[PDB]
């Protein structure tokens, strides 16, 4: 585990990793930082069509779980249309995002943390199973964590978003592997969704994204989240109030959301009326826009293994000759 002395003073909620620690956490901290630097530089955002694609990405991809705007009337008075005069399903696809168009994000992101965040359609007993995706405005506060994970997988995992990518990329790699020239190690990571916690991982990346988003304009909004005051506590003699960008504002709320966990609410119609919401450190399984972060760590943590860890830790002198010129751009493919 990372020692508490290895962290800096807090910048708001997040902390930075000291350079004095140089384990595999540092290469985690330094890959997610530089990938976060290439987004505050990237002018693909503040483009109206690019912002319309990301909001379309949360609605269309998954069927959604809940309506926590009934919970999010607690700080802002909403008229709460039930939409029984429109016959439409009250799932998170349509019933949430239509009501988001009235209220800005900044009057909502300060009070997003819900216990029935996800799992069931705004009622504790229905006929549906407790399922994976969460609120569209808590996916919107998880938006940079998707984007920095997309930049790690951009130069490595050219998936190209095509309907034929198993039969074009996976199948010939399957056939190029197992050939009599090369022997392979099919590396599988079991329970990877329940292996990304704030205790180790989500504290490092939220510190890496926050130092990575320090580049660029500190006075710059992002997707409707304005710049704000952070409370800097790094210097023990000089704490002060810093303006941080909206891209760093989302990481301040994301650190509060990752550390409290993810509130799975079980409301299955199989057992007679068992019903409880509870946190976990487990990511949703089938969310490909969120499970790409597991791809973002799979190539990254194999890269520290094949170059720094295993060429120093292994005792076989012959194997160090093999591990010298192994490279994840040549010798490791992940998805």
């Amino acid at each position: 585990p990372i020692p508490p002395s290895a962290w800096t003073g807090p910048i708001g909620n997040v902390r930075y990793l000291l350079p004095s620690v140089q384990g595999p956490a540092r290469h985690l901290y330094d890959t997610w930082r530089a990938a976060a630097r290439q987004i505050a530089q990237d002018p693909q955002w503040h483009d109206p069509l690019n912002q319309a694609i990301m909001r379309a990405q949360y609605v269309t991809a998954r069927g959604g779980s809940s309506a926590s705007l009934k919970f999010a009337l607690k700080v802002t008075g909403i008229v709460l249309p039930e939409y029984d005069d429109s016959k439409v399903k009250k799932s998170s696809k349509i019933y949430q995002a239509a009501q988001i168009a009235r209220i800005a994000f900044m009057l909502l992101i300060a009070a997003i943390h819900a216990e029935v965040t996800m799992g069931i359609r705004n009622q504790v007993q229905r006929r549906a199973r407790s399922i994976m995706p969460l609120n569209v405005i808590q996916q919107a506060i998880s938006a940079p964590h998707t984007l920095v994970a997309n930049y790690i997988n951009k130069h490595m995992n050219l998936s190209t978003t095509s309907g034929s990518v198993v039969t074009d990329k996976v199948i010939p790699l399957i056939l190029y592997a197992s050939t009599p020239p090369n022997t392979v190690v099919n590396v599988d990571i079991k329970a990877c969704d329940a292996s990304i916690t704030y205790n180790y991982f989500l504290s490092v990346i939220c510190g890496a994204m926050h130092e990575g988003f320090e580049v660029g304009n500190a006075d710059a909004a992002f997707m409707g989240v304005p710049s704000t005051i952070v409370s800097d506590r790094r210097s023990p003699v000089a704490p002060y109030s810093r303006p941080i960008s909206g891209l760093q504002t989302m990481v301040q709320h994301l650190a509060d959301l990752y550390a409290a966990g993810f509130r799975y609410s079980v409301s299955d119609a199989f057992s007679s009326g068992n019903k409880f919401s509870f946190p976990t450190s487990t990511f949703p399984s089938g969310s490909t826009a969120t499970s790409t972060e597991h791809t973002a760590n799979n190539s990254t943590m194999m890269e520290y293994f094949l170059n720094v860890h295993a060429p120093s830790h292994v005792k076989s002198a012959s194997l160090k000759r093999i591990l010298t010129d192994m490279t994840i751009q040549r010798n490791y493919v992940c998805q």
């Binding site: 004095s20 530089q41 002018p43 320090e214 660029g216 500190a218 790094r234 210097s235 000089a238 002060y240």
Partner: protein
Amino acid sequence: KVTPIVNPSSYVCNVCNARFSTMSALSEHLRSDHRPMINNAIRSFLTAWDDIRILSPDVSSKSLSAYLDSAVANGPELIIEDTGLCTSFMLLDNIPSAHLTKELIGFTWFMQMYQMTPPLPEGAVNRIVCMTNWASLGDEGRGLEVRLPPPTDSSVHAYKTVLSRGYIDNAQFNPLALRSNVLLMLLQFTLSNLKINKSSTFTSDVTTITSGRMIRAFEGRPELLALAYPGRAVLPTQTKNAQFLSTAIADRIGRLDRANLIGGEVSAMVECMELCDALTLHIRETYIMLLRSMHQDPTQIVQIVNECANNLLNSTIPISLRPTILCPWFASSEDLRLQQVMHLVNISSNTAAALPLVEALSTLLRSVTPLVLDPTVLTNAITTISESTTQTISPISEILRLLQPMGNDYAAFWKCIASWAYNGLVTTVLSEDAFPDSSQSITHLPSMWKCLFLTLAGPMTSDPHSPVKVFMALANLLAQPEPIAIGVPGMHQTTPASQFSHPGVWPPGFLNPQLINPQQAPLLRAFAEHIRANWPQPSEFGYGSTLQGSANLFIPSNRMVYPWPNQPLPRLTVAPTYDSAMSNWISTTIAFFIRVVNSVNMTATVNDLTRRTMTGVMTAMRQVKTMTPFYIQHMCPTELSVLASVTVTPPFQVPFTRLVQNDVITNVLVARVDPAQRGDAAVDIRATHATFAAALPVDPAAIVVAMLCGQTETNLIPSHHYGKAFAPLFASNAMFTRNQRAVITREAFVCARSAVAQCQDAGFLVPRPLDALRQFDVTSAAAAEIMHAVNDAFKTAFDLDGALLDGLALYGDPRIADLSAAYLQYGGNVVREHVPPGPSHIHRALQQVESTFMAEMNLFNVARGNLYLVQTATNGNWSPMAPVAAPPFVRGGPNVRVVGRFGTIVPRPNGLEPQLIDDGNVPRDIAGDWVYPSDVLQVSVAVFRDYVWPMVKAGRTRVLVELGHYVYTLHYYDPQISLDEAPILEEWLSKINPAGIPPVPFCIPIPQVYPCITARRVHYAFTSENNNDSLFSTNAASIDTAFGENAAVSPLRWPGLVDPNYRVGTNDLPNRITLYNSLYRYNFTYPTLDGIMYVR
């Protein structure tokens, strides 16, 4: 329950039923019960622990240096005023005469009896203790202060400020780090005291005490009015204060010359006499002299703002008089250089630092620019060329594939411009994924249009190897038809044009196109003929104002080099013209690739009708009327001149180079350590300096869209469009914040490199007034605590938030702190433009405090001279601090013996006395006169206390304790009651460790008012040098002291009050401190920029 009113007289341990009269006794016994290896770390954690102090030299925050746009944006507090009176020495009464046991009527008289507060203290011991700002009722005190307790207390926590926490316990001071702790207190004495003296209000003395003198009107606080003015004392009886205050001259009080200017307006500067030391007043007047040094008059600051805005901003000043107008915002050109290197020392020298810094411009650069990109024009220019659709390959369609980014992706052009101000840190590199590969030929069509896009976007990117990559990307692409010779072996012609990033692998044909044969490679010589003739000329222009200065290091000041031959800004309606060097560069590439398309190699493969299409596209691309050739030449150098002084960091430039082999800037270098102190003066400059490795992969496909397709509003007045856009970012004085940063960056740098080199032995050329003091630990980590604590004080006194002086301990040796900068050229030009500090003011102030510390060490609870331990059983007066007799047995005297390094008693058998090893390694007998060094007595203390200290109590030996300077703690007693100093002095011996010593317990009798009978008493400890320099008055409220010393109020402390020969404006400042002086108070108004000028 009801809250307690009084502390418990008896403290319980609750472990054992042990009553304690003092909480300090309970604090040790609870600590005693906590105590193998486990309890030692538990006892030490309760021993060396305290966090209540402000300074933390032991907390070494690892890599706290991180530059921020908001860190400089908070300015330091300079204008902190002092409405009260500027003295640092309060006249503290240790022993009131009410504590005297015998009290008869009329011997002592108090002013409290007459409902009046005394001006001078009234007791039986009055010391002058250093308590800063005790009377300072100015606004918003400086944070750090030093408040020494009186000599009756311990007074060592003021001298544990560095090198002392973990090493020695609380009751001691570290004498081998004493010069560090004293001098760091003096820095804490100075920076606590950098205020501005402000006149409060002046009434006439309507009463009869001075009868009309313009008294300082302390309105709401009469408890300081009586202390400000001893001349207005009522003298009822013959108080010994009244013996002194009778000699007070009547007209030495209140204001003398109110230097007013305007009737009705507040005065500029009054000149009044009040109670103030001569030392604080010197610190105040050198602070105004610091504060005037960054002041400019408003006739000249409007010339600065207009020249900073290039005279296109409408800023007017009223021409009239303005009395009190300190507007302190102007560091010189030298001090901005010192912050600019300190900016480059704080940062990480990789690409993590310039990449925040480029977009600082590029956000503001896109905010103010008139150039509106609109790629429909170059699209409409290409899609309206004619092509038969029956072909397989479309040169129209296969190049718009290589043209369009999906997002905007056009701010990368503006990052490419903004890197020209920052070519020292970052060099924008042509993006390696945009080079055509070493697999496709020139017949492969999208590989050729990449080479057009590289050749067009060549001079935009600021990489020094840009034209050799432009030249090679075609020479790669036609390696089969046109072969040439490529440099050293290992780099062939089919090397993929990105590995030619070193000046040694430029091909010889590129340096000299005559080396390429036209009969062999005609198409490739003419591209070496192309680049060497049409690559743009690196011109230059000015920015900022010459009056303010600039933070240019390698460029001459207030200038900026620029990779294009600029022209001044037009004020009429502009139109896209083709006279630019851009249009010279653009038209000649198209004139070259019309030759490549219509060459012989493309003739044999590419069909003739689709060859006309490629010719038709480029000739259409050449004739696109775009504004960016006019923009980069005329309008863009104006806004790189304006935004270079409103962004948070000034431009750090290195001169551009058009294709010179020997002038390629390989490395740009900044060091934290000079090559003279460490023996590195002759080695290569890359080994002495740290190098800025930063790069930006600029995409050339987005440049050509920005370059060849850019337009502007038709009726553009570029003076008006810049005059309207720059107006919201000159209206504030926040532009002048970094000038206030740069002086505090200077004043902290000079005073920290002094404070390190004061504590070394003969470091930099700094004067060493405290060199008499003891300082042993001169290591790197010892001096790292010194610079970190000085850094911890300037961040506290001016209560700023940036990172000044951090990162000078990045390498870990701040004993060598010298800021240099250089850049190496491939020909071997080794420039080394290094920057010394400027003529600072606070470093002159601390140096004067250190000089007058030595004359009055006793005033800061530090006694000088050696220590005497002889048995002196007397009955009369006993003055340890002022020995009236001659000091006995000086070192080297008649049969005086000095103990060797171990402090070793050898035992002798059969009733023979134990012998002591002296300095000459000879065992000599105990009884006699001995000199002990301090460090010998720190380790021989158990041998001292058991073998030679009982020989002192018998009076048959006398021991000198040789040590230079030391904190003293005075102890007082009623001389009527008997006393023996040995329970008081063996407690001093019982805490001497090998690491430190306690302060020295001198026993002094309280001076009595009666000729009373006195007990015979035995004293041991007294000193050699006259160390009684802090005693103000021996006894005040009494009519006359009888038993003790008759040390009345010294008139040497008060020439300004009692001396008739006192001239106004004099002091004996390197000698003793005068406590009543004439001074100057101020009434400066502090205008904003709206209070100076008017900006529409």
